[PDB]
Amino acid sequence: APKAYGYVYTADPETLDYLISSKNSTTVVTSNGIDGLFTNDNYGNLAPAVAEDWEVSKDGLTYTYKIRKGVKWFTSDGEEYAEVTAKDFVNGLKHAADKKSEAMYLAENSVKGLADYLSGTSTDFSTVGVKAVDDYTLQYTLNQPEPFWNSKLTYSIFWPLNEEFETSKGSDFAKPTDPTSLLYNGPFLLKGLTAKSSVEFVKNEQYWDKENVHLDTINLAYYDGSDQESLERNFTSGAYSYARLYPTSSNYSKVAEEYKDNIYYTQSGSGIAGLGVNIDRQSYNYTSKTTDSEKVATKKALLNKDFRQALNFALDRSAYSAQINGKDGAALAVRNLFVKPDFVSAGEKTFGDLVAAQLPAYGDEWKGVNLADGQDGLFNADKAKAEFAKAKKALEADGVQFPIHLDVPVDQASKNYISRIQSFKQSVETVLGVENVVVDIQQMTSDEFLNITYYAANASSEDWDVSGGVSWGPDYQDPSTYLDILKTTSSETTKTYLGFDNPNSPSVVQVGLKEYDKLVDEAARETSDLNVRYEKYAAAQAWLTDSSLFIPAMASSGAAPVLSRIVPFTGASAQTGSKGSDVYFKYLKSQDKVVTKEEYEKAREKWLKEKAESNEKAQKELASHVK
């Protein structure tokens, strides 16, 4: 039935603790059940959720939220527990601080006093700038004005948590197979968790905003990538409400004929997929290298910027994207920049434009660069070979023997991840020569792969030389959400994308990341002129692009052919945060029949007009909240 949403999830959560986790697998299982102060409506506006109203001081430092009365916490079986209050947001942030949240970067330099509490120089949380002035008045005090502060409040570190419940559960709190170990205040109740099988929700029939909830049930089935045709097959049977299509499937010509009037393409998402370079590899439990000399050679090569540039310029991103999208749709998903090029603009210039204007200082090879989505602006075999020749001269003078062996891990279950990594291998080896670079693909089980990538505990666990296993999506509406996480001090995220968690590692200094820190920090200090702030963050992105420490390849979502029974443009629209329709299913409506491309385009053209007007009205209302 249309009120029974069915689709898939790709990884079992390590935790249900939404305050501590920075991983989408926790968002997938909690957002539908946990509301914070705002959501996102179908036009992308912030919509009142637990905050019924808000104000900001004239100096921009104090935000005050009127907590909606009558919003309740419920158990997984629908029993009322307590009333959501401002004290739950004080407790949420204290819990995030005390248990060292993986997402603390969003809050630690923003909320007054929080950095001192995290370091231990203050142990009294009353010195931290979150206060329950009364049970329905929540006040945050910031270190500096942040026009993007409210956009942070759709991210999970600012969600509420009832302290009495948390204390009552002890070490059983937020356990990943136990829906009774959280309480729910959102549009759905988390009902079922079965490892490698399902995530299950039911509509919260006592939800204050249930008039905006149009699904009775949500069921997500585990999908490990071993059968990419499974999505379309289960869509056709009616089990799934949606299906991402893979044109490389052997049955695709049949699918494309049957659904010729229904397949449509989604817009590219804001997250970035690509290949991180481990500049400080600690462990060799997944390697093809046979000698310590090869290990030393690879470590030295990965510290060489020209070597990394050679890999970056040798990667054919269209062919990489074609492994999941086919050749005809391949270019749509290509991305050339860590920050999505139009994520922000300074007047008429996109962020990508600002980066392109600063990149040529690093070399004439960047003059004329096209950083726009939807085309491969970085692939250039001639430039790849030229950079490699410089690297090889420098490395051979230091005793390094060639070829350089690169370990890239894959989950043996995900066929089209293997195909993507094989395309990387073919690109690099054909352009640069197998006498120069050998890509050694390390096959392992799904759990083994997660343990050295997505769920790696520390830098010692990042057992790889190059890896495309983990993407990054933006958490709030400012370039810092992409660029701050690669600073030398951002150890929770530097391990994932760059292999290090020691801010003082000599590998980190050798690749110049201290200069990156200073560029990011100079941008962060600009709070009086957004255009200048964005120009300064573009300087940091230009450094990152030249450094080739992360090899961008594609948007991490979107730019894909899909089938749908979801009524077009009814779901939440979010470019950042945890309340987009990928994870949060308020507002969404389903229909009986498969959506047609004509239905979708008609809705899109009306939505674009309505969104522009709605966003403009919202912007004009901002000043009325200044008190």
Curated annotation (Swiss-Prot):
Gene3D superfamilies: Dipeptide-binding Protein, Domain 1, Dipeptide-binding Protein, Domain 3, Periplasmic binding protein-like II. Belongs to the bacterial solute-binding protein 5 family. SUPFAM superfamilies: Periplasmic binding protein-like II. It is a lipid-anchor. PROSITE patterns: PROKAR_LIPOPROTEIN (PS51257), SBP_BACTERIAL_5 (PS01040). The keyword Ubl conjugation does not apply. Its main location: membrane. GO terms for molecular function: peptide transmembrane transporter activity. This is Oligopeptide-binding protein AmiA. It comes from the Bacteria. One of its GO terms (cellular component) is ATP-binding cassette (ABC) transporter complex. InterPro entries: Peptide/Ni-bd (IPR030678), SBP_5 (IPR039424), SBP_5_CS (IPR023765), SBP_5_dom (IPR000914). The keyword Transport applies. It is found in: Cell membrane. PANTHER family: PERIPLASMIC BINDING COMPONENT OF ABC TRANSPORTER, PERIPLASMIC OLIGOPEPTIDE-BINDING PROTEIN-RELATED. Part of the binding-protein-dependent transport system for oligopeptides; probably an oligopeptide binding protein. One of its GO terms (biological process) is peptide transport. Keywords: Cell membrane, Lipoprotein, Membrane, Palmitate, Peptide transport, Protein transport, Signal, Transport.
